[PDB]
């Protein structure tokens, strides 16, 4: 009744069993990979069965949400209320570090659309609007090949996988705005409006895209669905600890030996994972400065604390960092951390929509004062001010991008304070 052997998960347990597209990445080899088999029957068996399978599995918001799959699927099962319920799968993946999903749409796009049809039965809906990013035009065509055969055999559309249920999904391209990855900025892009994040209520279960109920789930939720429903939610939940269980794609990346996309088991000590994933941090963990296993909207953790932490959603936030999409970015001693957040805050400045004020001029302010940090035109008090400023932009924003702006820089203030202290002290010291 225990799984102390956290780690060492093989390809047969990875949800995207062909995440590198080595053998017939399309659905033609996927029906030989397990999915599309016995799929309409579990679909027709029960909408609450579908959420039961995802609840027994227990995937929680691996696309930076921390929300259990069972919870968001269960809020949906309300009977058809005339307005046409849909699904929407966030495939923007524009966060710096989020690239594991970009690989699987090129390699496992079948489970993307198969997860929609089985997941879509859970609310009794009729169609869906997968939002693959504009830079992912190659991904979009790969979905299109996957969806055409699904339409042709009835797997998607009317008679879903041969069950008589009418459920489809239209693949539409993006325009490379990272904000459109927000669960609320996603709505406007689908219905043809500037991607300015909306507010809740109305919730996805209530008015959403086109003013009707529609799930806005990540790549994983549909992608895992064929694997954690037919093969078994208990099979996935067998790996991993309580709540945070199973395996997720790890985006070991950054200045590391072998930056790869590995779907190793989750809820594992982070130490030996990225020590074995990319053959270890390039130059070693000793030469390493700070790995960020959550990605952009996640606090950087200093090298010493990276040596002693588990990467699950619980344990990482115990270390005050986020895990989000498991975008494991590595950055070592040679590069200066203030320069790291320099490019990070610059990305946030170019992705804010300016809808809500605290993010609009706020993310502008972080870049400006941090720009002084990099050269060193500040004072130790100004470090406190930017932390105080980061407190003000925390929470007060419409969406979590402003909150997502705080987490990386806020972690710096608590963790790499002396590194910032020497950064702006040197500028004035040798200026005189």
């Amino acid at each position: 009744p225990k799984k102390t052997s956290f780690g060492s998960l093989k390809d047969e347990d990875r949800i995207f069993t062909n995440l590198y597209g080595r053998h017939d990445w399309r659905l033609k080899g996927a029906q030989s990979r397990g999915d599309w088999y016995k799929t309409k029957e579990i679909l027709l068996k029960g909408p609450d069965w579908i959420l039961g399978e995802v609840k027994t599995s227990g995937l929680r918001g691996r696309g930076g949400a921390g929300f259990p799959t069972g919870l968001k699927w269960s809020f949906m099962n309300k009977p058809s209320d005339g307005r046409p319920k849909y699904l929407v799968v966030n495939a923007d993946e524009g966060e710096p570090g989020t690239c594991k999903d970009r690989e699987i749409i090129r390699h496992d796009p079948h489970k993307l659309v198969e997860g929609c049809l089985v997941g879509g039965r859970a609310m009794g809906a009729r169609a869906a609007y997968i939002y693959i990013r504009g830079e992912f035009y190659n991904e979009a065509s790969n979905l299109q090949v996957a969806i055409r055969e699904a339409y042709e055999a009835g797997l998607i559309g009317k008679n879903a996988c041969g069950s008589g249920y009418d459920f489809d999904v239209f693949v539409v391209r993006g325009a490379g705005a990272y904000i459109c990855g927000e669960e609320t900025a996603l709505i406007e892009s689908i219905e043809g409006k500037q991607g300015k994040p909306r507010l809740k209520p109305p919730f996805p279960a209530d008015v959403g895209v086109f003013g009707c109920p529609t799930t806005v789930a990540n790549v994983e939720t549909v992608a895992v669905s064929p694997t954690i429903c037919r093969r078994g939610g208990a099979w996935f939940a067998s790996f991993g600890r309580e709540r945070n269980s199973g395996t997720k794609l790890f985006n070991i990346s950054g200045h590391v030996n072998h930056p790869c996309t590995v779907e190793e088991e989750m809820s594992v000590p982070l130490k030996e994972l990225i020590e074995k994933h990319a053959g270890g941090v390039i130059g070693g963990w000793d030469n390493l400065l700070a790995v960020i296993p959550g990605g952009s909207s996640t606090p950087l953790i200093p090298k010493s604390v990276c040596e002693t932490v588990l990467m699950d959603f619980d344990a990482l936030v115990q270390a005050q960092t986020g895990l989000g999409t498991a975008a494991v970015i590595v950055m070592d001693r040679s590069t200066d951390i203030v320069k790291a957040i320099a490019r990070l805050i610059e990305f946030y400045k170019h992705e804010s929509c300016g809808q809500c004020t605290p993010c609009r001029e706020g993310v502008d302010w972080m870049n400006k004062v941090m720009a002084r940090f990099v050269k060193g035109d500040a004072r130790p008090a100004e470090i406190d001010s930017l932390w105080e400023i980061s407190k003000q932009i925390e929470g007060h924003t419409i969406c979590a991008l402003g909150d997502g702006a705080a987490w990386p820089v806020q972690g710096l203030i608590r963790h790499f304070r002396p590194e910032l202290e020497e950064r702006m002290q040197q500028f004035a010291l040798q200026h005189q």
Binding site: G21, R22, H23, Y151, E152, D168
Partner: protein, 45 residues
């Protein structure tokens, strides 16, 4: 026939056309189950 670990089966990542998405979409228009009527032609209508 069997699984091979040293091929880029997704050569589409390297070869495509200028219009890829929509010529496949006009093919998608074949099934494209009819969408529910909203009554009005648009919010202004």
């Amino acid at each position: 026939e069997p699984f091979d670990n040293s091929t880029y089966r997704n050569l589409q990542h390297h070869e495509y056309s200028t219009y890829t998405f929509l010529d496949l979409n006009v093919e998608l228009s074949k099934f494209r189950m009819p969408q529910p009527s909203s009554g009005r032609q648009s919010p202004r209508h």
